Design a binder for this molecule. Structure first.
Ligand SMILES: CC1(C)S[C@H]([C@H](NC(=O)[C@H](N)c2ccccc2)C(=O)O)N[C@H]1C(=O)O
Ligand SMILES: [Zn+2]
Ligand SMILES: [Zn+2]
Length: 243
């Protein structure tokens, strides 16, 4: 198959597997990155990344693809490659790159979770809410009763940044943590779309993510390949410029 060469988002490199319209990359024996692409007319493709985690006899998903059809392709890939049921998905804020495929998850009977605030914003953002709401303590950690049977997914709300509702997820038992759209890579020159951002609190929120997962060495994010912790520090330094 031909390589997909997005205008925004990482390129395909060694270890990147094309499946239909999407790309998959194994990050750890039990963790894979899913990548889907939105074609913007006149601009080209924008890649967005999420995660797939095997936890024993079940699979957990972080973020949908941009669309329902792409998200059904993620479920197809899981069926072919892993052949275990998806127990739940957690989506990391109410924008299209992270929640555009909710209906595909629901059609498949998968339990969906998002920040309560994401669910409240979804109908205002042209999204369908997740079926369950996560809530958070004053220090950002998820209230465990709201995240039942999450296995290795450790959900952390770092504060407002890219959006007010953005959440992040550490993968316990690995050195991986997922920043979603809050974190950009260590070579990025921009924080991306700031239209819904909290420019005052962004730098502290980025740093809070790093402090929540202080031994995560592989930082996964929505629009770049997995990076070092310099993604966190560089994002925070860019965000310092917003104040
Ligand atoms: C990659 C993006 C610049 S766009 C994406 C998101 N936007 C969407 O999901 C929009 N529905 C969209 C509109 C036009 C073109 C592409 C995406 C956002 O506003 O954070 N996340 C941004 C980001 O992570 O900075
Ligand atoms: Zn967003
Ligand atoms: Zn994004």
């Amino acid at each position: 198959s031909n390589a997909i060469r997005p205008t925004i988002g990482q390129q395909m490199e060694t270890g990147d597997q094309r499946f239909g319209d999407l790309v998959f990359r194994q990050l750890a024996p039990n963790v894979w990155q899913h990548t889907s692409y939105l074609d913007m007319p006149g601009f080209g493709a924008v890649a967005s990344n999420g995660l797939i985690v095997r936890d024993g006899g079940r699979v957990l998903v972080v973020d949908t693809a941009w669309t329902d059809d792409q998200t059904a392709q993620i479920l197809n890939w899981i069926k072919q490659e892993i052949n275990l049921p998806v127990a739940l998905a957690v989506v990391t804020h109410a924008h299209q790159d992270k929640m555009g495929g909710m209906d595909a998850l629901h059609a498949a009977g998968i339990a969906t979770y998002a920040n309560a605030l994401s669910n409240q914003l979804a109908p205002q953002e042209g999204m369908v809410a997740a079926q369950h709401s996560l809530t958070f303590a004053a220090n950002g950690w998820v209230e465990p009763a709201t995240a039942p049977n999450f296995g290795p997914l450790k959900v952390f709300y770092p504060g407002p940044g890219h959006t007010s509702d953005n959440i992040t997820v550490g993968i316990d038992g690995t050195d991986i943590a997922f920043g979603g759209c809050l974190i950009k890579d260590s070579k990025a020159k921009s924080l991306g779309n700031l239209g819904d951002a909290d420019t005052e609190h962004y730098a502290a929120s980025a740093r809070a993510f790093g402090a929540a997962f202080p031994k995560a060495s592989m930082i996964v994010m929505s629009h770049s390949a997995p990076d070092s912790r310099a993604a966190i520090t560089h994002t925070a330094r860019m965000a310092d410029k917003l104040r």
